[PDB]
Amino acid sequence: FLTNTTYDIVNNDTIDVLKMKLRNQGWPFVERYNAVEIDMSVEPLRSPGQVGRYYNPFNIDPLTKKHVEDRLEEFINQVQVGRFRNASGNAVGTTLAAFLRACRDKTSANWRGYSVLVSRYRSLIPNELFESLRNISGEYNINPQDEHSFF
C-alpha cells in the first residue's frame, strides 16, 4: 500500500528488507511489541489456591501506565506529516494518523477494564482444566474490518 508495489514483487523479500523499504518511505510501525505478563492469584477459600500469569491487554505496562513503545507519540507525528502515494493517493498519511491517535487514546483509556476482565475469566477455570488446555493449540482468523472496528 505505502511503497507502491505488488505482492508478487515483494514475495521473496525478507523481514529486514521489508523493514528497510518501509522505514525509508517514512513508516515507523514495523516492529512487534512483547506483552507484559501480569501475575494472578486466586484466593483459596474452600479449595486450594491457584497461581497463574496473563498478558496485559493492548501492550500497556501497568508500571508506566503507557504503551510499551516509548516513541509512540513521535511515531504517530511522523505518519501525520508523511507523504506515501503522491501520484495516486490523497491524504493517506493524515487519515491513517487520525486513526492511530483514536486507537491509542481508547486503549489507554480502557486497558484496566479489559485487564480486570481477563483476571475474572481466569478465576473461573479450575487448575486441572487449565493444565489440560495447555496441550491444545489454535489460531484465530479475524476479519480486517472486525479488528479495526474493535479498536
Binding site: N11, N12, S137, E139
Partner: protein, 249 residues
C-alpha cells in the same frame, strides 16, 4: 533443537541440505572432552555428583583442528544439538551445507582416511541411545558413499552386531529409498508421558531434558511453523511438497 525434532529420514536430510556448516561449529571455548568431574545436583544429593564429560553432551567442547574433529563436530551436532570449538576453518568450507560436506567431493575436503571404529569410540557409541546410534550411522553411510567405501561400511556393521540390527536402509544416491524409509529418528518431541520441570543426574540426561523442555516451549512459540494453519503464507520455494527431491538424488 530443530535438528533434534526431525523424526524421519526425509526431514533430517532436508534440514541438512539447508543448514550450513557454521551451525555445526560452535564459537564457545567449552572444556576438554574426557575428564572425571564433580557436578552439583542439589535436588538429589548434598554431596557433589561424579560424572565424566564427553563429546556428545549438549554443551560445546574443545575440538581438534584436524578433519577428524570436523566430522566429529558434525555428528555431535546431529545427535546432541551442539558442536565443538574448531575455529579458522575458512569461509569456503563453512558456507557449504552439512550434506555437501558429507556427500560431495566438490567441497575440497578429503575424508577417505577416516576410521569408523575410532570415530564411534571417541563419540562414546556405548552411551548413545537407539535414535542417536541411528543418526550417526546415517552420517557414516553418506561418508562411505562419497568416498566409495561401501564395502568398508558393511564390514564395520558386521563386526558390531547391535549396529547392524538398527542400521537404516537407504541408498545415498536414490531419493526413492528415503521416501519409503519409516525409521523414527526424533530425539525431542511432544511427550506422551508426564514431563516435569525436574533435573536429571548425568550431564547427558540433564542436557537432553533441557532440549525436550525447550522444544515444548518452541512448539507453542510464535517462531514455530504450523503447517495446518499457515501453509499458504509459506514461501513456495520452501513449501512442503510430495515430490521433494534432494539435488542429484
Amino acid at each position: 533443537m530443530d535438528v533434534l525434532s526431525k523424526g524421519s529420514l526425509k526431514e533430517l536430510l532436508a534440514h541438512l541440505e539447508k543448514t550450513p556448516l557454521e551451525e555445526a561449529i560452535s564459537y564457545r571455548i567449552g572444556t576438554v572432552p574426557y575428564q572425571n568431574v564433580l557436578i552439583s545436583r542439589n535436588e538429589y544429593y548434598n554431596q557433589l555428583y561424579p560424572d565424566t564429560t564427553s563429546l556428545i553432551d549438549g554443551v560445546s567442547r574443545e575440538g581438534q583442528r584436524n578433519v577428524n574433529g570436523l566430522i566429529m563436530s558434525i555428528i555431535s551436532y546431529v545427535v546432541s544439538g551442539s558442536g565443538h570449538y574448531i575455529p579458522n576453518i575458512g569461509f569456503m568450507l563453512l558456507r557449504r551445507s552439512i550434506l555437501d560436506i558429507l556427500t560431495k567431493h566438490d567441497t575440497g575436503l578429503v575424508t577417505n582416511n577416516l576410521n569408523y571404529g575410532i570415530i564411534a569410540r571417541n563419540l562414546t557409541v556405548s552411551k548413545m541411545n537407539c535414535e542417536q546410534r541411528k543418526r550417526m550411522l546415517i552420517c557414516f553411510k553418506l561418508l562411505a558413499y562419497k568416498d566409495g567405501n561401501q564395502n568398508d561400511y558393511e564390514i564395520y556393521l558386521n563386526q558390531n552386531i547391535p549396529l547392524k540390527q538398527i542400521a537404516p536402509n537407504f541408498i545415498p544416491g536414490d531419493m526413492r529409498t528415503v521416501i519409503h524409509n519409516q525409521d523414527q529418528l526424533a530425539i525431542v518431541g511432544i511427550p506422551a508421558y508426564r514431563l516435569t520441570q525436574s533435573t536429571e543426574l548425568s550431564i547427558r540426561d540433564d542436557n537432553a531434558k533441557s532440549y525436550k523442555l525447550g522444544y515444548v516451549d518452541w512448539y507453542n512459540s510464535n517462531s514455530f511453523l504450523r503447517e495446518r494453519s499457515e501453509f499458504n503464507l509459506i514461501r513456495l520455494k520452501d513449501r512442503d511438497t510430495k515430490y521433494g527431491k534432494l539435488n542429484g538424488w
